[PDB]
Amino acid sequence: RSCIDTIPKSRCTAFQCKHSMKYRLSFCRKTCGTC
Amino acid sequence: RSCIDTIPKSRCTAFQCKHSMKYRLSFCRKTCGTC
Amino acid sequence: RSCIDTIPKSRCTAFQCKHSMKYRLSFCRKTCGTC
Ligand SMILES: [Li+]
Ligand SMILES: [Li+]
């Protein structure tokens, strides 16, 4: 999978990176630090 | 989430923006350029 | 982190303070007003 966020990164939060697998690995993958 | 830094911006560093999700998205969100 | 510019301040611009996290927080940290 490419290392990108698929939604605008202003819509990504630390809460969602900890609590949501889909935010952490898909919507906000890059800014959550997965890649 | 509002576009602010929650710690003083003079404690935010590029290192923390690059290497810490919580700095990049929460403590230093604005000054890291997330929003 | 010390409040200094790590490049000569004559190379620092408002545009780089606004649009680049590394200039804002590192290269031009002092002249950009981060500290
Ligand atoms: Li997120
Ligand atoms: Li600059």
Swiss-Prot record, chains A, B, C:
One of its GO terms (biological process) is defense response to bacterium. Disulfide bonds join 3-35, 12-28, 17-32. InterPro entries: ShKT_dom. One of its GO terms (cellular component) is nematocyst. Transmembrane segments: none annotated. Changing residue 7 to Q: 10-fold decrease in potency of inhibition of Kv1.3/KCNA3. The keyword Secreted applies. Changing residue 9 to Q: 10-fold decrease in potency of inhibition of Kv1.3/KCNA3. Keywords: Antibiotic, Antimicrobial, Disulfide bond, Ion channel impairing toxin, Nematocyst, Neurotoxin, Pharmaceutical, Potassium channel impairing toxin, Secreted, Toxin, Voltage-gated potassium channel impairing toxin. Changing residue 21 to Q: More than 25-fold decrease in potency of inhibition of Kv1.3/KCNA3. The record marks 7, 9, 11, 20-21, 23, 27 as: Important residue for binding Kv1.3/KCNA3. Its main location: secreted. One of its GO terms (molecular function) is toxin activity. The keyword Disulfide bond applies. Belongs to the sea anemone type 1 potassium channel toxin family. Type 1a subfamily. Negative results: does not show or very weak activity on Kv1.5/KCNA5, Kv3.1/KCNC1, and Kv3.4/KCNC4 (IC(50)>100 nM). Peptide with both antimicrobial and neurotoxin activities. Inhibits voltage-dependent potassium channels. Potently blocks Kv1.1/KCNA1 (IC(50)=6.7-87 pM) and Kv1.3/KCNA3 (IC(50)=10-250 pM). Less potently blocks Kv1.4/KCNA4 (IC(50)=0.31 nM), and Kv1.6/KCNA6 (IC(50)=0.16 nM). Shows moderate activity on Kv1.2/KCNA2 (IC(50)=9 nM), Kv1.7/KCNA7 (IC(50)=11.5 nM), and KCa3.1/KCNN4 (Kd=0.03-30 nM). Blocks Kv channels by binding to a shallow vestibule at the outer entrance to the ion conduction pathway and occluding the entrance to the pore. This is Kappa-stichotoxin-She3a.
